[PDB]
Symmetry: D2
Subunit: 264 residues, 4 copies
């Protein structure tokens, strides 16, 4: 009776479907896949990448950056929503090939440093190549690259270091407040009485109100389905997108229903 | 005109005055100096150390542990209030000579990993040898060593990873709730409008209420003067010690007065 | 055309076949699987573990240690041959559950810190949970635990930080020089003109002579087949075991033949 | 009798005397102090910095880079001779303000990661702010930035990760082979029978022959006095500079004389 073999982290085929760079605003572009968000912000002093998706997406991300006229050495900063393999996967490889830095809070830094291993809920089942954080950001700290200011908003829940990023871009000169909020789900999490996360419910409830008050004109999520985005239709991608109130209120209803059946 | 020389972190002579192990409870001992707290908890499965003081105190700590019949390999865990040089100093040296592990939250871990350098308020002026954290603890997580359970209580303010530790010991069988709360001061900190700590005031106010509600029968602080402890008098050390309400209420008055004159 | 899914590191079923602790000397025991070596050294002051095998072997290792009367807190030190997933796999999990420290050289430390990712020859195909090294050892440095001295012998080749460990045990009082040498193979390695390892051939040739001169009465390897060990037969396990000269001379013949056909 | 206070790492005033950028070749510039070498290499795709000097030199280095028309974001890579405070000091601060990466071998990486603490010969007396390595280089590995190729040459002795860097620049089109070799001294080192460095003598002897065979037309050292450089005289700085043979042969005579009197 041999010990069980290792099992790889497999996802849906739509999570790995490459797409051409879809434009969100004057300086914001989606360069990930159909069901994984990878935001690129082109500035006058360099590019900024928010999340990266699965670890095997490092090559696809570099191709879309070259399509936007962005050399590897032009990527200046990598920002993360939360350090899971399906979002912070190719961060290690992108640091070696682009010369970019990674800015994340302490909780995301320690999770990214160990490659998602020893997860509070998943253990070692979802492990990705480890990467180090070059700058530790605090709640509400502003990060500026090429004149565009990125403000961090801590929303602990899915991970202790979940962060929503807000910045103001333009749409043919007319400004737009973009808010890239993280996930608010808890797939298979032990919500009540978790020894690894005793204050989990208090963090989710405080994060639901944090998402509601985010300065936002266009909402984006790491998984586009959470905010009712459809990258496949291109022009009509942001047609039925949800607000910050609708996204937080819908996630709280699922949280309370999951918390209620957990006690059953 | 040569560049200025480096300056060492010098403290008062009382902070470096060795003392014999002063007993606090049946299993708790003070093995630091007169003005620096180093709590040792002897259990049936090993010893636990809370803080260590200045970096040059590693030799004095090992001597007092040997006086208590504790070999270096018997030290099982090191706990920290906050990762500053005057408390988490000899942590790196103690890990090499005792085989103990360090448990701290993410904010204390990233601060301990870089040896206090790049401080949010002090910069590189107070640098100590770096040490790594072996276990990342969350708010309210319980750590048990030899039957004694240590509960973490996050109180961000002095540092983002300030932690108060509470545990129940005995006094000749009669139990006692000990609460080792961290400092609540802000020496020379920019309280309002700090770009490195935008939510500093919100963290201090929330930490003041956290200290008030701590389960406590005997309060101890990293600096014994903050809780009106006097290690020099030995038997009368805990005579005029402050409560949790008195300690938090007195620190908030100084915080508001400092915040008021800062706006002046 | 979706991007290819991730693939897990699968091995032979014999590499994951648990076995009872097989005795090697008075204080040395094999507690791994049939085709993976995990040496345990019981001393008067604690236990020492050399390698651990696949990452999913952490539970099996703790069971055999309990069979030998070794509690988790009794494991004092973990030693490694080279930081690959099939040997240094459960190191991260064993550190969290045993309170042991890890001693390895700089090259093994930086490879263990990133969980085998960014391998010089394998890339990210063989990734395991990352672990940190607590003590950096040099070539020829002696490590003593409970009176038994372990001497490190650098043999760079399979990995830049491959290390052979030698120590003197007994066999009913009669001493025996045990040498736990690392692998000398190069599976699919680019030997000549490797940009990631320009001095690869010089390191292998210098390592072949290092293995020949190792003080050895009984040779063991991470893979027992390399030294002609057969853990399955129990008593006759060390019957046809190879010497240090035979093991190094046979590995060099395969190295030269592989280097010759590589130029073809 | 209080414990002794901490003492800062003080150096000569000439080690902290700022100087204007002195030109070495068409693309190589000295931007450090009079007695500390800080080489800057301006390419078409960015700048490369070799060493930095004392930790308090980060501001002076950025000023000279601005004089050479090099913005902070233009610094692409930082190379190190050995990770001591008087050479790798401002590396941590330069990474935060320039967005550059650090390339060093495993031994320099683990020494830079702990800020020079726990030195093999100095202990914790010479501690500097810690910095992380982004790329691990091997012996003879080539690093190219903007067409200029930097080849690493391991020369363990002063530190286990001492590295000499060689590259070919020009002098008005006429090429010149520059070799930036590390120090070969051992100030107060225990050469024979050192438990922290058992193979110290073998590494020094092998490093002396390594420096002799370095491809070199102009030699530079971290301390300009070792190679008979005089940055103060400007034009006549490289007048009486030593060769690679003269520098290695003079250092070996001092090594043997120091090794001889150590046995006395
Ligand atoms: Zn997800
Ligand atoms: Zn203090
Ligand atoms: Zn193997
Ligand atoms: Zn020097």
């Amino acid at each position: 009776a041999p010990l069980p073999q290792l099992r790889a982290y497999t996802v849906d085929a739509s999570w790995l479907q490459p797409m051409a760079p879809l434009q969100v605003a004057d300086h914001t572009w989606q360069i990930g896949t159909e069901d994984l968000t990878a935001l690129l912000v082109q500035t006058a002093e360099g590019a900024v990448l928010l999340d990266g998706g699965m670890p095997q997406m490092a090559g696809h991300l570099l191709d879309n950056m070259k399509l936007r006229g962005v050399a590897p050495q032009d990527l200046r900063l990598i920002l993360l929503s939360h350090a899971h393999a399906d979002h912070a996967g190719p961060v290690a490889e992108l640091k070696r090939r682009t010369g970019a830095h990674v800015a994340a809070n302490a909780e995301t830094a320690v999770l990214l440093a160990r490659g998602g291993s020893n997860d509070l809920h998943f253990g070692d089942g979802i492990t990705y190549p480890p990467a180090s954080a070059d700058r530790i950001i605090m709640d509400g700290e502003v990060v500026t690259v090429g004149g565009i200011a990125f403000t961090a908003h801590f929303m602990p829940g899915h991970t202790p270091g979940s962060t929503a990023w807000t910045w103001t871009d333009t749409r043919d000169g007319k400004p737009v407040r973009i808010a890239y909020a993280d996930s608010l789900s808890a797939p298979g999490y032990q919500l009540k009485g978790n020894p690894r996360y005793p204050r989990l419910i208090e963090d989710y409830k405080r994060s639901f109100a944090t998402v509601r008050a985010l300065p936002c004109d266009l909402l984006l999520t790491p998984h586009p389905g959470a905010s009712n985005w459809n990258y496949a239709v291109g022009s009509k991608a942001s047609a039925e997108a949800l607000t910050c109130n609708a996204y937080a209120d819908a996630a709280e209803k699922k949280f309370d229903a999951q918390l209620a059946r957990e006690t059953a």
